[PDB]
Amino acid sequence: GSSPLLKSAEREKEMASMKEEFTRLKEALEKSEARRKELEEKMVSLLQEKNDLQLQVQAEQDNLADAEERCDQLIKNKIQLEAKVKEMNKRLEDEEEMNAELTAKKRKLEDECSELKRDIDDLELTLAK
Amino acid sequence: SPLLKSAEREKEMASMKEEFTRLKEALEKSEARRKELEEKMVSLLQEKNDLQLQVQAEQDNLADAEERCDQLIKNKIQLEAKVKEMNKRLEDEEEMNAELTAKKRKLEDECSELKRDIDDLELTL
């Protein structure tokens, strides 16, 4: 009678309300799944972008390693060429020293010869006739 | 027709009640994934930016090194020219000492003859 009739009215209050909540849940997930997708891709393209820089990093540290190798060779080489120079600058000073010493001996024997032509001369001009 | 509509109410309200727990659960997960990419994007921004800096520092090290080479190379080439110049000079200084030696010797021998012209001639007097 009176309850079974009232229970029918409150039942339809609860369906029209459930149809509001139905449009409401549908829309919340809809707006959040736009977001979860736009974001899943945005992570993909930043995760790849990380790895273009992580390889960029390996390419530079090994570009570097090979510079440091060429430097090591060129350093070791300079050492040796610098030693050849120092040692040739010594032999040089040594030969120029010999030059100077023979020049002095050559000059001493020129003086001596000119003096002994003078003694021969002065000796023989006692016999002169 | 109104005998029916009370059954057609209950089952629109059944199949809608099941779509609730389903959408409620798809909501909680869609959000959960979101929170997880935001968590992990933050962390990636802090990697990517570190690496951008790592590269700019290694390239500045590569440039230091490439410069250190270019100058060692130039310096080795200058040192090789210096070696060549000093050998050629050595040869020249040695040539000169051999000529000064032969001159030293002809004067030694010219003086030697003169000592005997004097000595041959001094005897008599």
- Residue A66 near residue B63 (C-beta atoms within 8 A): no
Q: Write the DSSP symbol of residue B125.
A: -
Distance CA A31, CA B65 (A): 54
Which CATH number belongs to the domain containing residue A28 in this structure? Answer: 1.20.5.340
Q: Shortest CB distance from A109 goes to which of B30, B90, B108?
A: B108
Distance CA B90, CA A93 (A): 10
Question: How many domains does one find in chain A?
Answer: 1
> In which domain, by residue range, is B8 found?
1-125
Q: Shortest CB distance from A53 goes to which of B51, B61, B73?
A: B51
Residues of chain B in contact with residue A68, where contact means CB-CB under 8 angstroms, are 65
Quote the minimal CA–CA distance from B94 to chain A in Å: 7
Among A61, A106, A57, which residue's Cα sits nearest to residue B53?
Answer: A57
- Cα three-residue angle B11-B17-B23, rounded to 5 degrees: 135
Sign of CA dihedral B45, B50, B51, B53: positive
Residue A2 phi/psi, 5° resolution? -85, -35
CA B33 to chain centre: 44
- Length reported for chain B: 125
Query: Do the Cβ atoms of B27 and A26 come within 8 Å?
Result: no
User: With 0-12 CB in 10 A as exposed, 13-18 as middle and 19+ as buried, what is A54?
Assistant: middle
Residues of chain B in contact with residue A64, where contact means CB-CB under 8 angstroms, are 58, 61-62, 65
Distance CA A107, CA A109 (A): 5
Q: Using only C-alpha atoms, what is the Rg of chain A?
A: 55
